[PDB]
């Protein structure tokens, strides 16, 4: 291996010599295996579970429970502090299990999309994992490529390679293949940077930890994850609930002390109530729902790189897509040639190969048989930076189609017969690409310039055109017939490139047009239909012509018979507010630069929407980052996009974006279920103790009974409600608004109904057993079992807000069944098992008492089912 500054200093042949690097053909299988045995794989060694377990204790509510347990052991109450500790342990353990499983499934899916590169080893260019690179191997750099290892570039026809990840400067750096005598390495392609423009070939000088900038990646792995917005808003909700409960419980302590009661019993009851009503399981249930959504998208094949996406996908309503790479498979092919004179050539065959003849007037043309078709093909061949090596394209698909056309014409060799002194490279702002070239053998020939691009810019740069091999000044009737043919090509679905060639820019000769057919991606039509039917709008932001964009959108189904399409120049002309009004009506945006695409994304974000931009292409990373949800394509996608994206579709399907929206929808509903259950039962217990202190009645519950209740209503029975599956009715619902608004008037009203029924039934049992005016253990036992059975019925009815219990079914939620079974068993143990009787201050009951308690406590289930049916019938 060599240092990068050394490899910059020494010449290319020297660097090839030290690594025994064959620049033309690469390292064979044995040459690599040897360097793999010596140097090893390219991975950054091995990337802590106990750190995660302790990190789950960073939640403030867990600290509030730990402080209560510390206060418990101060005034020693072993049983209370132990109970609070078990509560913390089960909630933290369930959060650990869910987070660990989610992150391991995410790592496996990330293994399903490995880093890759184009490496030539046996003289043949192959797709080889960046992990498998050994030093001295020959790697070919395309456009939009992450550099697989530290490389020594020995061929750089044109190269712009950003350095924002490594250096911190967003400006791309040009790389020249000349040796650099004595960050500033203008010849070394670093590790982890991205190729913005051009083609290259290099030899790798480092593998593994040998990379100079491996440390910024070391920091990137250990960057950690900031708290999710929901995780900040449900944390604030938990603090609000905790502080309201603190005020109420302090008032209860003061009332109980003033009215006359045991200070130790009052303090223990206050500590148990504080532990109860603090939503310790609320951040845990948010974490569980986010992790479960992450795994559910992983089963849907979507690499969710960022956690704040999982919730945001529920709120997504507008999806802005790109024609090429996203709505079309990007398998371009030039099929129709329109010569400037008016002749028409039909290029048969498909794919990036030289297989398929060009037919003009029913006759095959080869070489320079027709000089004008040959001139079009020659300009297309020379102008590209894309190469079809071993039947595999490197560069852009639109350039590769022109290369394959040249190979079909027998004229692929003209690329190497010219010397590209100056290059005006493609930018989406430009919409054209030009090259200055001189013929090899004919050095006396002038610096002829080849040009290709969008018809508008090309025809603007041409002052002359060609006619029967004669240069003629451009005429407006010819411009009109070219415009008609370009529009007719686009209306058939052909992407159209116009081609020019001449001495000096601004004086080129317009040779003609080529029609690149890009079929729309299979499965996009049906997914678009479903996506629109589910209340999500799909738009087509593009840089291509109106005719092509509209033809593709009509075939996909997002452009109806009466639909609006707006060019990017109008969007530039219209203000942001006018764009904001018009933008929900426009389905197709054509001729939009990445600045215009960002303008469209900003204008839909200003309307109050969550935009999910799906992107492909090097310049489309800024819009993917600017979107609320950047979505990339795992298989047919550049690494530039997949780095900037937020969710990566592994199998390249638009149905996955719907599934990611459905899973994001379900998370908020599950959190609503937890919130309603915990709040109803905590208000029930809190007002029971409040009424008991106010009316001077004996306390229906002691401190350890409230601690068992807290383990019930924040532990596995309450977490089960956050594991509750999603129903179909909320699936087709209009998109959730991006504000949280978790506690709605309907939810609080049902909470108060459940709290009122629980308090009423439990106080009725308490008074019924207290009618004899004797405070026997049996009475407190009946009251405690009443509250616990009320809790299990409130949990049966808290699973779904709208759907009835019987329609949902008991077998639907397995964790809920296990949790309620364990809670019933624990309650039976507290009633019957004599040591548990001694600690909980209980006494055994008859079977008839349990039957009566079940019958009474069914009231919350009955009333909740009644309200569900009433709301359903009112909706119907």
């Amino acid at each position, epitope marked *: 291996v060599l240092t990068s500054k050394k490899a910059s200093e020494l010449p290319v042949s020297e660097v090839a010599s030290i690594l025994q690097a064959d620049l033309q053909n690469g390292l064979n299988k044995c040459e690599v295996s040897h360097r793999r045995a010596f140097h090893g794989w390219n991975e950054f060694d091995i990337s802590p579970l106990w750190k995660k377990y302790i990190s789950q204790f960073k939640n403030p509510l867990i600290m509030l429970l730990l402080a209560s347990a510390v206060i418990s052991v101060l005034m020693h109450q072993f049983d209370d502090a132990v109970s609070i500790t078990v509560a913390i342990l089960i909630v933290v353990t369930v959060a650990f299990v869910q987070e660990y499983r989610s992150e391991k499934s995410l790592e496996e899916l990330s293994k399903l999309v490995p880093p890759e590169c184009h490496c030539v080893r046996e003289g043949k260019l192959e*797709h080889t994992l960046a992990r498998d690179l050994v030093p001295g191997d020959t790697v070919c750099l395309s456009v939009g490529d992450r550099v697989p290892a530290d490389l020594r570039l020995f061929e750089a026809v044109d190269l712009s390679i950003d350095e924002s990840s490594l250096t911190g400067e967003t400006t791309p750096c040009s790389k020249v293949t000349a040796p650099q005598p004595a960050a500033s390495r203008s010849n070394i392609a670093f590790m982890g940077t991205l190729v913005r423009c051009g083609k290259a070939k290099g030899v790798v000088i480092g593998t593994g930890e040998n990379s100079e900038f491996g440390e910024v990646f070391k920091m990137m792995q250990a960057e950690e994850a900031p708290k999710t917005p929901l995780q900040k808003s449900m944390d604030l909700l938990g603090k609000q609930l905790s502080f309201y409960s603190f005020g109420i419980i302090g008032i209860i302590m003061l009332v109980g002390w003033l009215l006359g009661k045991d200070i130790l019993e009052m303090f223990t009851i206050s500590v148990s109530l504080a532990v109860a009503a603090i939503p310790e399981g609320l951040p845990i249930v948010v974490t569980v729902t986010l992790a479960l959504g992450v795994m559910r998208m992983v089963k849907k094949r979507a690499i969710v790189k960022k956690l704040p996406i999982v919730e945001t996908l529920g709120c997504c309503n507008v999806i802005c897509s790109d024609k090429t790479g996203t709505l079309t498979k990007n*398998e371009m092919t030039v*099929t*129709h040639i329109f010569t400037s004179d008016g002749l*028409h050539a*039909e290029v*048969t*065959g*498909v*794919g*990036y*190969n030289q*297989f*398929g*003849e060009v*037919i003009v007037d*029913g006759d*095959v043309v080869h070489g320079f048989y027709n000089p004008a078709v040959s001139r079009i093909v020659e300009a297309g061949c020379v102008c590209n930076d894309a190469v079809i090596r071993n*039947n*595999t394209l490197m560069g852009k698909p639109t350039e590769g189609a022109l290369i394959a056309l040249a190979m079909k014409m027998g004229l692929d060799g003209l690329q190497q017969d010219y010397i590209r002194k100056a290059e005006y490279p493609f930018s989406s702002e430009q919409k054209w690409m030009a090259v200055k070239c001189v013929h090899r053998t004919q050095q006396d020939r002038p610096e002829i310039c080849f040009m290709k691009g969008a018809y508008e810019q090309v025809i603007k740069y041409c002052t002359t055109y060609q006619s029967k091999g004669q240069t003629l000044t451009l005429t407006q009737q010819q411009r009109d017939v070219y415009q008609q043919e370009k529009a*007719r*090509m686009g*209306s*058939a*679905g*052909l992407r159209v490139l116009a081609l020019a060639s001449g001495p000096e820019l601004g004086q080129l000769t317009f040779l003609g047009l080529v*029609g690149i*057919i890009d079929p729309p991606r299979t499965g996009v039509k049906e997914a678009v239909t479903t996506l629109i039917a589910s209340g999500v709008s799909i738009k087509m932001i593009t840089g291509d012509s109106q005719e092509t964009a509209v033809a593709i959108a009509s075939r996909l189904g997002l452009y109806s018979k009466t639909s609006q399409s707006v060019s990017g120049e109008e969007i530039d002309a219209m203000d942001v507010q006018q764009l904001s009004q018009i933008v929900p009506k426009v389905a197709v945006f054509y001729r939009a630069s990445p600045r215009h695409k960002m303008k469209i994304i900003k204008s839909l974000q200003k309307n109050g929407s969550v935009v999910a931009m799906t992107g492909d292409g090097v310049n489309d990373a800024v819009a993917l980052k600017a979107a609320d949800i950047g979505v990339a394509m795992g298989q047919t996608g550049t690494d530039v996009c997949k780095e900037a994206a937020d969710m990566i579709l592994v199998d390249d399907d638009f149905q996955t974006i719907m599934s990611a929206i459905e899973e994001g929808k379900g998370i908020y509903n599950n959190i609503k279920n937890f919130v309603r259950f915990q709040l109803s039962t905590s208000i029930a217990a809190l007002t029971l103790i409040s009424l008991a202190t106010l009316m001077n009645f004996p306390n229906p519950l002691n401190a350890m009974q409230i601690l068992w209740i807290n383990i019930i209503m924040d532990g596995p029975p309450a977490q089960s409600l956050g594991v509750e599956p999603v129903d179909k009715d909320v699936i087709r619902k209009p998109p959730r608004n991006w504000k949280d608004s978790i506690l709605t008037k309907n939810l609080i009203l049902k909470i108060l109904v459940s709290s009122i029924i629980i308090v009423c039934g439990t106080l009725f049992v308490f008074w019924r057993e207290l009618r004899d005016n004797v405070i026997t253990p049996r009475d407190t036992t009946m009251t405690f079992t009443c509250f616990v059975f009320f809790d299990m019925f409130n949990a049966l009815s808290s699973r779904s807000q709208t759907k009835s219990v019987f329609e949902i079914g008991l077998c639907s939620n397995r964790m809920f069944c296990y949790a309620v079974l364990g809670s019933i068993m624990g309650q039976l143990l507290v009633i019957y098992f004599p040591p548990l009787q001694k600690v909980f201050q209980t006494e055994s009951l008859s079977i008839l008492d349990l039957l009566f308690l079940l019958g009474l406590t069914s009231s919350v289930c009955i009333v909740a089912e009644i309200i569900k049916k009433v709301e359903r019938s009112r909706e119907k």
Partner: nanobody
Amino acid sequence: QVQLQESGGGLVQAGGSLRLSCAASGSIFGADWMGWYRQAPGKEREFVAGIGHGASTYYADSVKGRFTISRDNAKNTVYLQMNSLKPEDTAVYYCAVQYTQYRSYDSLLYWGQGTQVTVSS
């Protein structure tokens, strides 16, 4: 509209002979170009063997000298023979036919449903 049907696919051993047939509903007279394409997972579809308008037969450079093609309008079916196949070059095969147009610029390209051939070592 012409309909393309693929047949003859099946399991064959190395060193044997494999038959494939692609039948078209319409008479194959005006169709200029027609040939097979090899699609494999992890890579783009690649050419197999085809015949063009000027009686010129195109073969893939890697599969050259081994795969043979023929056409007959009596049974309106193009007929492909695999000889001395390897386990490495097995994948799913699609027969595709193009037609000459020219006011409409829509490509008259017709694909087949495809038949999968799997050969192990």
